[PDB]
């Protein structure tokens, strides 16, 4: 557990705190109050807007500069503590700007494998190792450890069973015979839609959660009755339910780079241990309501090296300026997930600004932005969106999607580099069509 000793330079502390143990509502305030007392320049790193909003609740009234729109408080101007999301921190490290020389970095959910979180751990741990700063990483599953069954406030009954992943008409009576409340993690929105329809058909009350619907739908879990929450991994962090069962497919979709050539949303494939621990961690939280059960349908992923986020983290970190041209390393327990030589992705000055602008203003995925920038293409030149090979054609409703270009021509979306994330769902395609049209 935490002690003020850990606030000295050259100390990186990983607080292994199991789900429900108090990372956000107990330990984080404790750390922040001591940093405020001792006037340490501190940044708090939340993985998501949601967790940031949860953080402000727990830090209510303390002098914290919230560098996120997810929170709106009056700032005194004397605030020495900043709060932002992992991706915001990493993006700002990429700008030609003045990053404060924070003495203390506090990262909550330090297992997050978003490429910007991985890159932030690399930068932060390198700065600690150089003697410049102190850092505290909090998670239930410290990087480098593979325990899918961490401790809990109340004992959890874990049972491996065949978990249905499609609509069913028989053979799974235990799903619907249950009279409690179930949180069911599914690999995708479309997959949860089919299961939710099947459960609704059988007379259950279902709330569905995803990135696209979380805002409006999650509050319903607080105020309406419900039998099932069917959720994507949106609910792995910063989401809590009054449930007594989790059903876990133990699968996910994850971006994968095929042959160095393109990015697909591979799967469904096994989740990591960290993600299984988070999913299981939705229950077993209430010592007054024992009896919770975790029903899971397969193993966890033994190697995450196929995940594109590892290489994308190195693309960010190779281009984050440290000191007179040094390059930060990935956080050591995770450094073996990428086999690329040191500095392989460092871009020269001009191509680097393009990569940065492609990601921030352009909102392209890291891997894609890097392909464009490293080809010498300028930010506003969108011709590559239309001149790929035929197998790069983006479909809409099984018909080649089309775009009115800045030159008043209707062209089929066929990007020179295919990254499935630009058209994996409706909002993504819409954002990329605007990009291909020259609108941002």
Per CB under 7 A, residues contacting RNA are 47-50, 52, 68-70, 84-88, 91, 114-116, 187-190, 210-212, 214, 232-234, 237, 252-255, 265, 360-361, 363, 365, 421, 424-425, 428
Phi, psi for residue 252 in degrees, rounded to 5: -155, 165
Residue 29: its H or E element: helix 28-37
HSE-up of 78 (CA within 13 Å, CB side)? 5
How far is the first Cα of the chain from the last one, in angstroms, to the nearest whole number?
A: 47
In angstroms, the CA 432 to CA 440 distance is: 10
Please give the sequence-ordered ranges of beta strands (E in DSSP) within 68-108, or none if there are none. 81-85, 104-108
Residue 12: its H or E element: strand 12-16
CB 417 within 8 A of CB 366: no
| Residue 24 touches which of Mn ion, RNA, none (Cβ within 5-8 Å per kind) | Mn ion
Nearer to RNA, 7 or 206 (CB): 206
Residue 129 C-beta: closest distance to RNA, Å: 25
How many C-beta atoms lie closer than 10 Å to residue 407's C-beta?
10
| Residue 87 touches which of Mn ion, RNA, none (Cβ within 5-8 Å per kind) | RNA
Residue 422 C-beta: closest distance to RNA, Å: 9
Nearer to RNA, 102 or 367 (CB): 367
Nearer to Mn ion, 24 or 117 (CB): 24
SS3 call for 117: helix
| Residue 234 touches which of Mn ion, RNA, none (Cβ within 5-8 Å per kind) | RNA
Using rule CB under 5 A, residue 153 touches Mn ion: no
Nearer to RNA, 66 or 411 (CB): 66
Residue 48 C-beta: closest distance to RNA, Å: 4
| Residue 23 touches which of Mn ion, RNA, none (Cβ within 5-8 Å per kind) | Mn ion
Residue 309 C-beta: closest distance to RNA, Å: 8
| Residue 11 touches which of RNA, Mn ion, none (Cβ within 5-8 Å per kind) | none
**Tokens 């700063």 map to which residue?**
133
| Residue 421 touches which of Mn ion, RNA, none (Cβ within 5-8 Å per kind) | RNA
SS3 call for 102: coil
CB 373 within 8 A of CB 347: yes
CB 382 within 8 A of CB 434: no
CB 128 within 8 A of CB 101: no
Residue 214: its H or E element: helix 214-223
CB 301 within 8 A of CB 271: yes
Residue 144 C-beta: closest distance to Mn ion, Å: 20
Cis previous bond, 268, omega within 30: yes
CB 372 within 8 A of CB 347: no
CB 336 within 8 A of CB 140: no
Residue nearest to Mn ion (CB): 24
Nearer to Mn ion, 51 or 253 (CB): 51
Residue 403 C-beta: closest distance to RNA, Å: 19
Residue 207 C-beta: closest distance to RNA, Å: 14
Judged by CB under 5 A, how many residues of this single chain contact Mn ion? Answer: 2
Residue 165 C-beta: closest distance to RNA, Å: 13
Cis previous bond, 247, omega within 30: no
Nearer to RNA, 49 or 332 (CB): 49
Nearer to Mn ion, 52 or 320 (CB): 52
Reading the block at residue 1, the tokens are 């557990």
| Residue 363 touches which of RNA, Mn ion, none (Cβ within 5-8 Å per kind) | RNA
Residue 22 C-beta: closest distance to Mn ion, Å: 8
Nearer to RNA, 38 or 380 (CB): 380
Nearer to RNA, 80 or 428 (CB): 428
In angstroms, the CA 38 to CA 375 distance is: 49
8-27: which residues touch Mn ion (CB under 5 A)? 23-24
Contact positions vs Mn ion (CB under 5 A) = 23-24
């Amino acid at each position: 557990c935490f002690e003020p000793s850990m606030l000295k330079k050259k100390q990186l502390t990983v607080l292994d705190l199991h789900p429900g143990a108090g990372k956000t509502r107990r330990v984080l305030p404790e750390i922040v109050r001591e940093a405020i007392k001792t006037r340490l320049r501190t940044v708090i790193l939340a993985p998501t807007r949601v967790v940031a909003a949860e953080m402000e609740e727990a830090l209510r009234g303390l002098p914290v500069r919230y560098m996120t729109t997810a929170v709106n408080v009056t700032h005194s101007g004397t605030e020495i503590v900043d709060l932002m999301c992992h991706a915001t921190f990493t993006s700002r490290l990429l700008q030609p700007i003045r990053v404060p020389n924070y003495n203390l970095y506090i990262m909550d959910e330090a297992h997050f494998t978003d490429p910007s979180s991985i890159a932030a751990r690399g930068y932060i741990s390198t700065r600690v190792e150089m003697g410049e700063a102190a850092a505290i990483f909090m998670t239930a599953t410290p990087p480098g450890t593979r325990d899918a069954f961490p401790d809990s406030n109340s004992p959890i009954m874990d049972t491996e069973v065949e978990v249905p992943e499609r609509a069913w008409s028989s053979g799974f009576d235990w799903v619907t015979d249950h009279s409690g409340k179930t949180v069911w993690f599914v690999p995708s929105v479309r997959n949860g839609n089919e299961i939710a329809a099947c459960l609704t058909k059988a007379g259950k009350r279902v709330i569905q959660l995803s990135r696209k619907t979380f805002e409006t739908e999650f509050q319903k879990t607080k105020h309406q009755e419900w039998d099932f929450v069917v959720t994507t991994d949106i609910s792995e962090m910063g989401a809590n339910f009054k449930a007594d069962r989790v059903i876990d497919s133990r699968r996910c979709l994850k971006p994968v780079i095929l042959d160095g050539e393109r990015v697909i949303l591979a799967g469904p494939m096994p989740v990591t241990h960290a993600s299984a621990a988070q999913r299981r961690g939705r229950i077993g939280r209430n010592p007054n309501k024992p009896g919770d059960e975790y029903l899971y349908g397969g193993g966890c992923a033994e190697t995450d090296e196929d995940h594109a986020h590892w290489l994308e983290a190195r693309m960010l970190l190779d281009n984050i300026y440290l000191q007179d041209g040094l390059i930060a390393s990935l956080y050591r327990p995770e450094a073996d997930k990428v086999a690329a030589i040191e500095g392989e992705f460092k871009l020269r000055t001009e191509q680097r600004k393009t990569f940065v602008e492609l990601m921030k203003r352009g909102d392209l995925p890291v891997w894609l932005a890097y392909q464009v920038a490293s080809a010498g293409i300028t930010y506003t030149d969108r011709r590559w969106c239309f001149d790929g090979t035929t197998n790069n054609t983006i479909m809409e409703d099984s018909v080649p999607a089309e775009v009115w270009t800045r030159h008043g021509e209707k062209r089929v979306l066929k990007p020179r580099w295919m990254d499935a994330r630009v058209c994996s769902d409706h909002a993504a395609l819409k954002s990329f069509k605007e990009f291909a049209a020259g609108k941002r």
